[model samples]
Target: LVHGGPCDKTSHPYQAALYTSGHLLCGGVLIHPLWVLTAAHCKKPNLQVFLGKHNLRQRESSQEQSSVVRAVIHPDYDAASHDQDIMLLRLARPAKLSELIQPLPLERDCSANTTSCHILGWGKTADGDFPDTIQCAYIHLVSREECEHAYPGQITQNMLCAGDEKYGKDSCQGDSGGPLVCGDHLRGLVSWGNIPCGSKEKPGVYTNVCRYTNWIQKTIQ
Candidate 1:
């Protein structure tokens, strides 16, 4: 999370740190005991998840670890264009629900009223350092028109934008697949954005999870 502050595990239990071969790669949102929602771009052959861990460097007892049983990438996802950039991962075993480990509810419609949102990440900060503690920042959902105008033809119906574009606070490298929680709902997935980190006008772009509710429900069952 670029330019964000450290957040506690208790505050964001749905946070999932993804790893590939023991190396942290991306973030995810735990939507079910055995299901995690991430980004298609973050999908790797060998995927692992660690939940309830705020400090990535520590092996906390509260953390639950599991290997991925299957990864379901959206069929319509376009790599080149970054459309429908969402995916789901099935854990080999279900995580035991606790105060520190639980699923979050997904919203079918993240309307204009749901503007204020929170994003947590274990990714690099402005100094290019990946912190042990998961960092979080408050960002607002930008209008589709403003986002499209900023990116120009790149924004799709399946995509949404959010960030403090005026100040450059955004989801940076390694933050992909993270959650964009609007109120009580898991609203979006960290997708693509300006690699340099936005602020010049490019609000961070995300995969609108509301557009994939049916696909997610169908895939989970």
Candidate 2:
């Protein structure tokens, strides 16, 4: 999320930086050698993904770039409410998986009991500027009832909320579509959050990755 400090690029091997005509836009997760998981709202005319990347302006030998051959957005996705806001990208060629580039397993069940999870991205910092290195933060999962109370009817069944009531922790702009990992499985996808970064009672919202296991498998196949 937004305020997370810089992190080692190798920490999250599955992390991917999505680009539109070479300009970074959002983050993504490598679910397969040829597939990337991201947000539907991030669709663009010319898409590319940088894998095993740590620095934005520099290139590394381990880094692999791939052109997106196709993007499959959820057919029922609602832009107004950001419901079912998930998408899958098919790479023109499979990535060469390594210690610096790997795939994260999808959560099989639709429920998780974990109280906290980790999210990584290259989003803006507390000063409202983008960073060269990736950033990460541990965010506590907020209950649906509490989240619904915070955002009213805006919280939907397809969405999951995570953040702290005390604030100072969240996922912000430019972090959309990044993975919310619990254990080694992907639990959520960074969707949206209130402006002003980490604000009290404004937890970051995510697309429940577990709820779309069926769709992910069906569409990818």
Candidate 3:
């Protein structure tokens, strides 16, 4: 029994969308009226975006909003492990932003307090299949010390962590390259994390927007 949003079929008056690369579902986020922000890894040879969707099980309800990846920027991105797996997408035209659907902003220069944030996406919920429609969750940011403890020398200074250590909610595979947003600011990008959705021991990892504030500004501006 879902308590928060209307049943997906009834709630999302706006169209559904996703980023696809070479037949693979990559990361994506609704940025502006028509633009989406995604990971550079998903920007392959023939990248395309599909919008106006309702259910993945019923592919017929979906329409395609195709485009080419005009640019990619992943300075410290690690190929094997997927570090800094973020990229900006300029759609041929902007999508209409509305109350049901809106774009997130890029926040920069926030202090330690600002690190507390959340990520929203259509990811799986607690050992279930991907929701027929989009679903969002609140993500708690992890401090530098906690992040380092989680990764054990793997987490870098450029990465931020989020998710509840007890209850467990996180950005999983289906949510890669989506935005880690807070206070209307795009703070991070989904990059990597342990499987099984959310394990108490492994906090959901993301690309630290504060680390790439300059690059993000330069590319988008």
Pick the lDDT winner.
1
Error of 3 at 99 (Å): 3.2
TM-score of 1: 0.96
Q: How well is each residue in 1-221 modelled by candidate 3, as lDDT tens digits?
A: 01112134433333235544434365466655556667666566556765544455566433456575465656666767667777766666676444545555666754646655555556555546556555655667887788878888888766778777656767776667766776667777877787766746788778777677677667667
Note the Cα lDDT for every prediction shown: 0.89, 0.88, 0.62
Query: Tens digit of lDDT per residue, candidate 2, span 175-212?
Result: 99999998779999999988888846688899988889
| lDDT at position 29, candidate 3 | 63
- Point out where model 2 deviates above 4 Å: none
- Which candidate, 2 or 3, would have the higher lDDT against the true structure? 2
Estimate the TM-score of every prediction.
0.96, 0.96, 0.78
Error of 1 at 35 (Å): 0.2
Candidates sorted by lDDT, descending order?
Answer: 1, 2, 3
